[PDB]
Coordinates of C-alpha atoms and ligand atoms in Angstrom, one line a residue:
Chain A
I1 CA 119.9 109.4 195.0
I2 CA 119.6 107.5 191.7
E3 CA 121.6 108.9 188.9
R4 CA 121.6 106.6 185.8
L5 CA 119.6 104.0 184.1
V6 CA 121.3 100.7 184.5
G7 CA 119.5 100.0 181.2
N8 CA 116.1 98.2 181.0
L9 CA 114.9 94.7 181.9
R10 CA 114.0 94.1 178.3
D11 CA 117.6 93.2 177.9
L12 CA 116.9 90.0 180.0
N13 CA 117.0 89.6 183.0
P14 CA 114.6 86.6 183.2
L15 CA 114.1 87.5 187.0
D16 CA 115.8 85.6 188.5
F17 CA 115.5 88.8 190.6
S18 CA 113.1 90.3 193.1
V19 CA 112.0 93.4 191.3
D20 CA 110.5 96.4 193.1
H21 CA 108.7 98.5 190.7
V22 CA 108.1 102.3 190.9
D23 CA 104.8 103.2 189.4
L24 CA 104.5 106.1 186.9
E25 CA 101.7 107.5 185.0
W26 CA 102.5 108.2 181.4
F27 CA 102.9 111.9 182.0
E28 CA 105.2 111.6 184.9
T29 CA 108.1 109.9 183.0
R30 CA 109.9 113.2 182.2
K31 CA 110.7 114.7 185.6
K32 CA 114.4 115.0 186.2
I33 CA 114.0 115.5 189.9
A34 CA 111.3 113.7 192.0
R35 CA 110.9 111.6 195.1
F36 CA 109.2 108.2 195.1
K37 CA 107.9 105.4 197.3
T38 CA 108.3 102.2 195.4
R39 CA 105.8 99.4 195.3
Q40 CA 107.2 97.7 198.4
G41 CA 107.5 100.6 200.8
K42 CA 111.1 101.7 199.9
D43 CA 112.2 105.3 199.2
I44 CA 113.8 106.6 196.0
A45 CA 115.1 110.0 195.0
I46 CA 116.1 110.7 191.4
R47 CA 118.3 113.3 189.6
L48 CA 119.1 112.5 186.1
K49 CA 122.2 113.1 184.0
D50 CA 121.0 112.4 180.4
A51 CA 117.4 111.6 181.1
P52 CA 116.5 110.0 177.8
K53 CA 114.8 113.0 176.1
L54 CA 111.5 111.2 175.5
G55 CA 111.2 110.1 179.2
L56 CA 111.5 107.0 181.3
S57 CA 110.4 103.8 179.6
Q58 CA 108.8 100.5 180.8
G59 CA 111.2 98.7 183.1
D60 CA 114.1 101.2 183.0
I61 CA 116.4 99.9 185.8
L62 CA 116.7 102.6 188.4
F63 CA 118.6 100.5 191.0
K64 CA 120.3 97.1 191.0
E65 CA 121.8 95.5 194.1
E66 CA 122.6 91.8 193.8
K67 CA 119.3 90.2 192.5
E68 CA 117.5 93.1 194.4
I69 CA 116.1 95.4 191.6
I70 CA 114.1 98.6 191.3
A71 CA 112.5 99.3 187.8
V72 CA 110.0 101.7 186.2
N73 CA 106.5 100.5 185.8
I74 CA 104.2 102.6 183.7
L75 CA 100.6 102.5 184.8
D76 CA 97.8 101.9 182.5
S77 CA 95.4 104.5 181.4
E78 CA 92.4 105.0 179.2
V79 CA 93.7 105.2 175.6
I80 CA 92.1 106.0 172.3
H81 CA 93.7 103.7 169.9
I82 CA 93.4 105.1 166.4
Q83 CA 93.4 103.1 163.1
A84 CA 94.0 105.4 160.1
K85 CA 93.1 104.1 156.7
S86 CA 95.5 106.1 154.5
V87 CA 98.5 108.5 154.6
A88 CA 96.1 111.4 153.9
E89 CA 94.2 110.4 157.0
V90 CA 97.2 110.1 159.2
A91 CA 98.2 113.6 158.3
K92 CA 94.7 114.8 159.0
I93 CA 94.6 113.2 162.4
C94 CA 98.0 114.3 163.5
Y95 CA 97.6 117.8 162.4
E96 CA 94.2 118.0 164.0
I97 CA 95.4 116.5 167.3
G98 CA 98.5 118.6 167.3
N99 CA 96.2 121.5 166.9
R100 CA 94.4 120.3 170.0
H101 CA 97.8 120.1 171.9
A102 CA 96.9 116.6 173.0
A103 CA 99.6 114.0 173.4
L104 CA 100.2 111.4 170.7
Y105 CA 101.9 108.2 170.4
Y106 CA 102.8 105.8 167.6
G107 CA 100.8 102.6 167.6
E108 CA 101.9 99.1 167.2
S109 CA 101.1 99.0 163.4
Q110 CA 102.0 101.6 160.7
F111 CA 98.6 103.5 160.7
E112 CA 97.8 103.0 164.3
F113 CA 98.1 105.8 166.8
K114 CA 97.3 106.2 170.5
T115 CA 96.3 109.3 172.4
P116 CA 95.1 109.7 176.0
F117 CA 91.5 109.5 176.2
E118 CA 89.7 112.8 176.5
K119 CA 86.2 113.3 175.4
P120 CA 86.8 116.3 173.1
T121 CA 89.5 114.3 171.2
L122 CA 87.0 111.5 171.0
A123 CA 84.3 113.9 169.8
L124 CA 86.8 115.2 167.2
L125 CA 87.7 111.7 166.0
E126 CA 84.1 110.8 165.3
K127 CA 83.3 114.2 163.7
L128 CA 85.9 113.2 161.1
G129 CA 84.8 109.6 161.3
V130 CA 88.1 107.9 162.0
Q131 CA 88.1 104.4 163.4
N132 CA 89.2 104.2 167.0
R133 CA 88.7 102.3 170.3
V134 CA 89.2 103.2 173.9
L135 CA 91.2 100.6 175.8
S136 CA 92.8 100.6 179.2
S137 CA 96.4 100.3 178.1
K138 CA 100.0 101.4 178.4
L139 CA 101.6 104.4 176.7
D140 CA 105.4 103.9 176.2
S141 CA 107.4 107.2 176.5
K142 CA 109.5 105.9 173.7
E143 CA 106.4 105.9 171.4
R144 CA 105.7 109.6 171.9
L145 CA 105.7 112.3 169.2
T146 CA 108.1 115.0 170.5
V147 CA 106.4 118.4 169.9
Chain B
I1 CA 76.1 141.6 143.1
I2 CA 77.6 138.2 142.1
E3 CA 76.0 135.2 143.8
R4 CA 77.0 132.1 142.1
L5 CA 79.9 130.2 140.8
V6 CA 79.2 129.7 137.2
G7 CA 81.8 126.9 137.8
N8 CA 85.4 127.1 136.9
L9 CA 87.5 127.7 133.7
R10 CA 89.1 124.3 134.2
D11 CA 86.0 122.8 132.5
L12 CA 87.2 124.4 129.2
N13 CA 86.6 127.2 128.1
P14 CA 89.6 127.4 125.7
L15 CA 89.1 131.2 125.8
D16 CA 87.7 131.9 123.3
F17 CA 86.8 134.6 125.8
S18 CA 88.3 137.9 127.0
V19 CA 88.9 137.0 130.7
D20 CA 89.1 139.7 133.2
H21 CA 90.6 138.1 136.4
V22 CA 90.1 139.2 140.0
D23 CA 93.3 138.6 141.9
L24 CA 93.1 137.1 145.3
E25 CA 95.7 136.1 147.9
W26 CA 95.3 132.6 149.3
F27 CA 93.9 133.8 152.6
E28 CA 91.3 136.0 150.9
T29 CA 89.4 133.1 149.2
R30 CA 87.0 132.8 152.1
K31 CA 85.1 136.0 152.5
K32 CA 81.5 135.6 151.6
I33 CA 81.0 139.4 151.4
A34 CA 83.6 141.8 150.0
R35 CA 84.1 144.3 147.1
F36 CA 86.7 144.2 144.3
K37 CA 88.3 146.0 141.5
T38 CA 89.1 143.5 138.7
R39 CA 92.3 143.4 136.6
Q40 CA 90.9 145.7 134.0
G41 CA 89.3 148.5 136.1
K42 CA 85.9 146.9 136.6
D43 CA 84.0 146.6 140.0
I44 CA 82.6 143.5 141.6
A45 CA 80.4 142.9 144.6
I46 CA 80.0 139.4 146.1
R47 CA 77.6 137.7 148.5
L48 CA 77.8 133.9 148.6
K49 CA 75.1 131.3 148.7
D50 CA 77.0 128.0 149.2
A51 CA 80.6 129.4 149.2
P52 CA 82.4 126.2 148.7
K53 CA 83.5 125.7 152.4
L54 CA 87.2 125.5 151.5
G55 CA 86.9 128.8 149.7
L56 CA 87.2 130.2 146.2
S57 CA 89.4 128.2 143.8
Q58 CA 91.6 129.1 140.8
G59 CA 89.4 130.3 138.0
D60 CA 86.1 130.2 139.8
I61 CA 83.8 131.8 137.3
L62 CA 82.3 134.9 139.0
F63 CA 80.8 136.5 136.0
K64 CA 79.9 135.4 132.4
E65 CA 78.4 137.7 129.8
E66 CA 78.8 136.5 126.2
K67 CA 82.5 135.8 125.7
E68 CA 83.1 138.4 128.4
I69 CA 84.3 136.6 131.6
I70 CA 85.5 137.5 135.1
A71 CA 87.1 134.8 137.3
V72 CA 89.2 134.3 140.4
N73 CA 93.0 134.3 140.0
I74 CA 95.0 133.3 143.1
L75 CA 98.3 135.1 143.4
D76 CA 101.4 133.1 144.1
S77 CA 102.9 133.3 147.6
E78 CA 106.1 132.1 149.3
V79 CA 105.5 128.5 150.2
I80 CA 107.4 125.8 152.2
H81 CA 107.2 122.6 150.2
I82 CA 107.8 119.6 152.5
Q83 CA 108.9 116.3 151.5
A84 CA 108.4 113.6 154.1
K85 CA 110.5 110.4 153.7
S86 CA 108.2 108.2 155.8
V87 CA 104.6 107.8 157.2
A88 CA 106.4 108.2 160.6
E89 CA 107.8 111.5 159.4
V90 CA 104.4 112.6 158.0
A91 CA 102.8 112.1 161.4
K92 CA 105.6 114.0 163.1
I93 CA 105.4 117.0 160.7
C94 CA 101.6 117.3 160.8
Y95 CA 101.4 116.9 164.5
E96 CA 104.1 119.4 165.0
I97 CA 102.7 122.0 162.6
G98 CA 99.2 121.5 163.9
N99 CA 100.7 122.1 167.3
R100 CA 101.9 125.4 166.0
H101 CA 98.5 126.3 164.5
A102 CA 100.1 126.9 161.1
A103 CA 98.2 126.2 157.9
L104 CA 98.7 123.0 156.1
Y105 CA 98.1 121.7 152.6
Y106 CA 98.4 118.5 150.8
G107 CA 101.1 118.3 148.3
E108 CA 101.3 117.1 144.7
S109 CA 102.8 113.6 145.6
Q110 CA 102.1 111.4 148.6
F111 CA 104.5 112.6 151.2
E112 CA 104.6 116.2 150.1
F113 CA 102.9 119.0 152.1
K114 CA 102.9 122.7 151.7
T115 CA 102.6 125.3 154.4
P116 CA 102.8 129.1 154.0
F117 CA 106.3 130.4 154.6
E118 CA 106.9 131.7 158.2
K119 CA 110.3 131.7 159.7
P120 CA 109.4 129.8 162.9
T121 CA 107.8 127.1 160.8
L122 CA 110.9 126.9 158.8
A123 CA 113.1 126.9 161.9
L124 CA 111.0 124.0 163.1
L125 CA 111.4 122.1 159.9
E126 CA 115.1 122.3 160.1
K127 CA 115.2 121.5 163.8
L128 CA 113.5 118.2 162.8
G129 CA 115.7 117.9 159.7
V130 CA 112.8 117.6 157.3
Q131 CA 113.6 118.2 153.7
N132 CA 111.8 121.2 152.3
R133 CA 112.1 124.1 149.8
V134 CA 110.7 127.5 149.7
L135 CA 109.0 128.3 146.4
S136 CA 106.8 131.1 145.2
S137 CA 103.6 129.1 144.4
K138 CA 99.9 128.7 144.5
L139 CA 97.9 127.4 147.5
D140 CA 94.6 125.6 146.5
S141 CA 91.9 125.9 149.1
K142 CA 90.9 122.5 147.9
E143 CA 94.2 121.2 149.2
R144 CA 94.0 122.5 152.8
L145 CA 93.7 120.4 156.0
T146 CA 90.5 121.4 157.7
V147 CA 90.5 121.7 161.6
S148 CA 87.0 120.8 162.9
Chain C
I1 CA 109.4 156.9 151.3
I2 CA 107.7 157.8 154.6
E3 CA 109.8 157.2 157.7
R4 CA 108.2 158.5 160.8
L5 CA 104.9 159.1 162.5
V6 CA 104.5 162.9 162.7
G7 CA 102.1 161.8 165.5
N8 CA 98.4 161.4 165.3
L9 CA 95.4 163.7 164.4
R10 CA 94.1 162.9 167.9
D11 CA 96.4 165.7 169.0
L12 CA 94.1 168.1 167.2
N13 CA 94.3 169.0 164.4
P14 CA 90.7 170.1 164.0
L15 CA 91.2 169.9 160.2
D16 CA 91.7 172.6 159.2
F17 CA 93.4 170.3 156.7
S18 CA 92.5 168.4 153.6
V19 CA 93.2 164.9 154.9
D20 CA 93.9 162.0 152.6
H21 CA 93.7 158.7 154.6
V22 CA 95.4 155.4 154.0
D23 CA 93.1 152.5 154.7
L24 CA 94.4 149.5 156.7
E25 CA 92.6 146.4 158.1
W26 CA 93.4 145.7 161.8
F27 CA 95.8 142.9 161.0
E28 CA 97.8 144.9 158.4
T29 CA 98.9 147.5 161.0
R30 CA 102.2 145.9 161.6
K31 CA 104.1 145.7 158.3
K32 CA 107.3 147.8 158.4
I33 CA 107.5 147.8 154.6
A34 CA 104.6 147.9 152.1
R35 CA 103.3 150.1 149.4
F36 CA 99.9 151.9 149.2
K37 CA 97.4 153.9 147.1
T38 CA 95.8 156.4 149.4
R39 CA 92.1 157.3 149.4
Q40 CA 92.4 160.0 146.7
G41 CA 94.7 158.3 144.1
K42 CA 98.1 159.2 145.7
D43 CA 100.9 156.7 146.2
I44 CA 102.9 156.0 149.4
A45 CA 105.9 153.7 150.3
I46 CA 106.7 153.0 153.9
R47 CA 109.8 151.9 155.8
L48 CA 109.7 152.1 159.6
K49 CA 112.2 153.1 162.1
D50 CA 110.6 152.5 165.5
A51 CA 107.3 151.1 164.2
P52 CA 105.4 151.3 167.5
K53 CA 105.4 147.6 168.5
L54 CA 101.7 147.1 168.7
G55 CA 101.3 148.6 165.2
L56 CA 100.0 151.7 163.5
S57 CA 97.1 153.4 165.2
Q58 CA 94.0 155.4 164.1
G59 CA 95.0 158.6 162.3
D60 CA 98.8 158.0 162.6
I61 CA 100.1 161.0 160.6
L62 CA 102.2 159.5 157.8
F63 CA 102.6 162.6 155.7
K64 CA 102.1 166.3 156.4
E65 CA 102.8 169.0 153.8
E66 CA 101.2 172.4 154.6
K67 CA 97.5 171.6 155.5
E68 CA 97.7 168.6 153.1
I69 CA 97.8 165.5 155.3
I70 CA 97.9 161.7 154.8
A71 CA 97.0 159.6 157.8
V72 CA 96.1 156.0 158.8
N73 CA 92.5 155.0 158.7
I74 CA 91.7 151.6 160.2
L75 CA 88.8 149.9 158.4
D76 CA 86.0 149.4 160.8
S77 CA 85.4 145.6 161.3
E78 CA 82.9 143.3 162.9
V79 CA 83.6 143.4 166.6
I80 CA 82.3 141.6 169.6
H81 CA 82.0 144.1 172.5
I82 CA 82.1 142.4 175.9
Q83 CA 80.7 143.8 179.1
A84 CA 82.1 141.9 182.1
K85 CA 80.2 141.9 185.4
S86 CA 83.1 141.4 187.8
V87 CA 86.8 140.9 188.0
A88 CA 86.1 137.2 188.3
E89 CA 84.3 137.4 185.0
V90 CA 87.1 139.4 183.4
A91 CA 89.6 136.8 184.3
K92 CA 87.4 134.0 183.0
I93 CA 86.8 135.8 179.6
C94 CA 90.5 136.6 179.1
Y95 CA 91.8 133.3 180.0
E96 CA 89.3 131.7 177.8
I97 CA 89.8 133.8 174.7
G98 CA 93.6 133.7 175.4
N99 CA 93.2 130.0 175.3
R100 CA 91.4 130.3 172.0
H101 CA 94.3 132.4 170.7
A102 CA 91.9 135.0 169.5
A103 CA 92.8 138.7 169.6
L104 CA 91.7 140.9 172.4
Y105 CA 91.4 144.7 173.1
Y106 CA 90.7 146.8 176.1
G107 CA 87.3 148.5 175.8
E108 CA 86.3 152.0 176.7
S109 CA 85.3 151.3 180.3
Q110 CA 87.0 149.1 182.9
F111 CA 85.0 145.9 182.3
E112 CA 84.8 146.3 178.5
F113 CA 86.7 144.3 176.1
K114 CA 86.7 144.0 172.3
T115 CA 87.6 141.0 170.2
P116 CA 87.2 140.3 166.4
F117 CA 84.0 138.6 165.6
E118 CA 84.4 135.0 165.1
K119 CA 81.5 132.5 165.5
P120 CA 83.2 130.1 167.9
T121 CA 84.3 133.1 170.0
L122 CA 80.7 134.2 170.1
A123 CA 79.5 130.7 170.7
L124 CA 81.9 130.6 173.7
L125 CA 80.8 133.9 175.1
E126 CA 77.2 132.7 175.2
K127 CA 78.2 129.3 176.6
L128 CA 79.5 131.3 179.5
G129 CA 76.6 133.6 179.2
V130 CA 78.6 136.8 179.1
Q131 CA 77.0 139.9 177.8
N132 CA 78.2 141.2 174.5
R133 CA 77.1 142.9 171.3
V134 CA 78.4 142.7 167.8
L135 CA 79.1 146.1 166.3
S136 CA 80.9 147.3 163.3
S137 CA 83.7 149.3 164.8
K138 CA 87.4 150.2 165.1
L139 CA 90.1 148.2 166.8
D140 CA 92.9 150.6 167.9
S141 CA 96.3 148.8 167.9
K142 CA 97.1 150.8 171.0
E143 CA 94.3 148.9 172.8
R144 CA 95.6 145.4 172.2
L145 CA 96.7 142.9 174.8
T146 CA 100.1 141.9 173.7
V147 CA 101.5 138.3 173.7
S148 CA 104.9 136.4 173.9
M149 CA 105.5 133.0 172.3
Chain D
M1 CA 81.9 98.4 197.9
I2 CA 81.3 101.4 195.6
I3 CA 80.9 105.1 196.4
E4 CA 78.3 107.0 194.4
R5 CA 77.6 110.4 195.8
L6 CA 79.3 113.1 197.7
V7 CA 77.7 113.3 201.1
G8 CA 78.7 116.9 200.9
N9 CA 81.9 118.4 202.4
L10 CA 83.4 118.7 205.9
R11 CA 83.4 122.5 205.4
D12 CA 79.8 122.3 206.5
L13 CA 81.0 121.4 210.0
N14 CA 81.5 118.7 211.1
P15 CA 83.9 119.8 214.0
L16 CA 85.2 116.2 214.1
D17 CA 83.8 114.9 216.4
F18 CA 84.7 112.0 214.0
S19 CA 87.6 109.8 213.1
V20 CA 88.3 110.9 209.5
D21 CA 90.1 108.8 207.0
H22 CA 91.3 110.9 204.0
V23 CA 91.8 109.9 200.4
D24 CA 94.8 111.7 199.1
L25 CA 94.6 113.2 195.7
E26 CA 96.9 115.3 193.6
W27 CA 95.2 118.4 192.0
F28 CA 95.1 116.8 188.5
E29 CA 93.5 113.6 189.8
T30 CA 90.3 115.2 191.1
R31 CA 88.4 114.5 187.9
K32 CA 88.3 110.8 187.4
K33 CA 84.8 109.3 187.6
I34 CA 86.0 105.8 188.0
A35 CA 89.1 104.8 190.0
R36 CA 90.1 102.7 192.9
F37 CA 91.8 104.0 196.1
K38 CA 93.6 103.0 199.2
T39 CA 92.8 105.5 201.9
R40 CA 95.3 107.0 204.4
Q41 CA 94.5 104.2 206.9
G42 CA 94.8 101.3 204.5
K43 CA 91.1 101.2 203.6
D44 CA 89.8 100.3 200.2
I45 CA 87.5 102.4 198.1
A46 CA 86.1 102.3 194.6
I47 CA 84.3 105.2 193.0
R48 CA 81.8 105.7 190.2
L49 CA 80.2 109.1 190.1
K50 CA 76.8 110.3 189.1
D51 CA 77.0 114.0 188.9
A52 CA 80.7 114.3 189.6
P53 CA 81.0 118.0 190.1
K54 CA 82.2 119.3 186.7
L55 CA 85.3 121.1 188.0
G56 CA 86.5 118.1 190.0
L57 CA 86.4 116.7 193.6
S58 CA 87.2 119.4 196.2
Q59 CA 88.9 119.6 199.6
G60 CA 87.0 117.5 202.2
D61 CA 84.3 116.1 199.9
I62 CA 82.8 113.4 202.0
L63 CA 82.9 110.1 200.1
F64 CA 81.8 107.9 202.9
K65 CA 80.2 108.4 206.2
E66 CA 79.3 105.6 208.7
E67 CA 78.5 106.8 212.2
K68 CA 81.3 109.0 213.3
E69 CA 83.5 107.1 210.8
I70 CA 84.3 109.3 207.8
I71 CA 86.1 109.1 204.5
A72 CA 86.9 112.5 202.8
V73 CA 89.0 113.9 199.9
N74 CA 92.3 115.5 200.7
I75 CA 94.1 117.4 198.0
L76 CA 97.9 117.1 198.3
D77 CA 99.8 120.4 198.1
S78 CA 102.1 121.3 195.2
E79 CA 104.3 124.0 194.0
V80 CA 102.1 127.0 193.1
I81 CA 102.7 130.4 191.6
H82 CA 100.6 132.9 193.5
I83 CA 99.9 135.9 191.4
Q84 CA 98.9 139.3 192.7
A85 CA 97.6 141.6 190.1
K86 CA 97.6 145.3 190.8
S87 CA 94.7 146.3 188.5
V88 CA 91.8 145.0 186.4
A89 CA 93.8 145.8 183.3
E90 CA 96.6 143.6 184.7
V91 CA 94.3 140.8 185.5
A92 CA 93.0 140.7 182.0
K93 CA 96.6 140.7 180.7
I94 CA 97.8 137.9 182.9
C95 CA 94.8 135.7 182.3
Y96 CA 94.8 136.2 178.5
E97 CA 98.5 135.6 178.4
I98 CA 98.3 132.4 180.6
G99 CA 95.3 131.3 178.7
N100 CA 97.4 131.7 175.6
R101 CA 100.0 129.5 177.2
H102 CA 97.3 126.9 178.0
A103 CA 98.5 126.8 181.6
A104 CA 96.0 126.0 184.4
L105 CA 94.6 128.8 186.4
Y106 CA 92.9 129.2 189.7
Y107 CA 91.1 132.0 191.5
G108 CA 93.2 133.2 194.5
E109 CA 92.0 134.0 198.0
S110 CA 91.7 137.8 197.4
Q111 CA 90.3 139.6 194.4
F112 CA 93.4 140.2 192.3
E113 CA 95.0 136.9 193.3
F114 CA 95.4 133.9 191.0
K115 CA 97.3 130.7 191.4
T116 CA 98.7 128.5 188.6
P117 CA 100.9 125.4 188.9
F118 CA 104.5 126.1 189.0
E119 CA 106.3 125.7 185.7
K120 CA 109.4 127.6 184.8
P121 CA 108.1 129.1 181.5
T122 CA 105.0 130.4 183.4
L123 CA 107.3 132.0 185.8
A124 CA 109.5 133.3 183.0
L125 CA 106.5 135.0 181.5
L126 CA 105.3 136.4 184.8
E127 CA 108.6 138.3 185.3
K128 CA 108.8 139.3 181.7
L129 CA 105.5 141.2 182.3
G130 CA 106.7 142.2 185.8
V131 CA 103.8 140.8 187.7
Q132 CA 104.2 140.3 191.4
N133 CA 104.1 136.6 192.4
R134 CA 105.5 134.0 194.8
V135 CA 106.0 130.3 194.7
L136 CA 104.6 128.4 197.6
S137 CA 103.9 124.9 198.4
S138 CA 100.1 124.9 198.6
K139 CA 96.7 123.5 197.7
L140 CA 94.7 124.0 194.4
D141 CA 91.1 123.3 195.1
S142 CA 89.2 122.1 192.1
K143 CA 86.4 124.4 192.8
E144 CA 88.7 127.3 192.2
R145 CA 89.6 126.4 188.7
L146 CA 89.0 128.6 185.5
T147 CA 87.1 126.2 183.3
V148 CA 87.8 126.2 179.5
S149 CA 84.6 124.8 178.0
Ligands
CU1 CU1 97.7 126.7 171.4

């Protein structure tokens, strides 16, 4: 039974280590209790004291024994990447998506946003003519807008 | 039966005219068909060809006979005035309010937004520590965020 | 200041009484405090102890002095009347309207339901091909499906 | 190589008779048109779907069939609130209310039965209204879903 993050590989960790990833979809990162089969057969239970409120992030270190590591890998998904032109537009989009109850993530740049691809959201985004592309891509839990 | 905006007093019109106002609440600006009793007793019927989608605005000229005018006043209401500090914060507010299905309007400056007062909306805005004030004020339909 | 329902004219009351109605839209039925001008000039203030949770209903007797009565009238409104085939269909309708966050009322019969007319709601009801008709009609607050948020 | 059509469903027996390799899906995964899978017995399978049944892949949809060698869809079980409504009024209430929550909703085995994923608020609600329900580890067939259009 895993209890706490031993932090995240991002704090290198230039491996250096054999790393056995657990593979999560973006929406799975928030369970406190769940059972997993890691990439290399292994078994892993989790119960979380202080599960970072926004969820598990990329490479969160679940387990660490010697150089033997287990970390969180977040699977890629179809993602509508949104490029708003102005602050007025950001507001429009967010409100409108919020109204849709779809999920929404901050993008890499200041007017960029990412949301799971769904066709109604897509339809919406064109109806208001915002500039967007669908890419298979990663959605970091730490990028999510709470709600 | 009134049919047409003869425009809006904002295009002066330095009155100049005895103006009898019809007094609408903000949520009332969007009927196409309804009946009214103006400020000074009179009676008005409306059916709208091209009712500006966003609804009736402040001083939309309903009726114009000589210097005798009837127009739309919009009554003040309790309003939460929201002042976002960042574009990050804008996004968060709008998403969260949209997620609540509350109404939202653009503010006077760039990170200002106005939403009707409701206690849950307020509760929300504190929970996120956004800086806001409740003021009795006017909501322009021209200032609203759609939902399409 | 009016305080209690003295009931409702439905408990006849075959008038018998000069009745002066107060006219409320279906969404207004739930203020505990507000002021009114009745149908024949009169003025009424309200403050409610035990405002029946769902709101004021049709002909809720506000005021009763002799045979002189004031009651609640509920402005008839545009209403989609829904006639469901089967329980399955009921469940589909209710879930889908619920999902829309529209308002919903029990009809007269078992598979009848009433909801305010909105064009997307109608659109929807055709998209599923449910049988309905729009009528101008009353929406009794006692007939509402509640909600908890 | 790539799978294109359902060759139907085992339900149309098929009293196996066959060695059947299943593909194991969660109930939310039944609606991808393009994805890659490793079957129960290691095999590899890609899908692209013309006329993917709108509501999703169902229990035992035959992806692949070569001789007596078969690949079918299995839907993994999950925690499931099983709801047993006493009346048609109560169905409507439940569905509208859940609809309003935006929870997922499936037709049960019997007429007044409905199944929705387990979540604690959905539970919370269901008691608040005093509906009779039980949580059970079980299967949510995609064909049993209440749309939303
Ligand atoms: Cu909603």
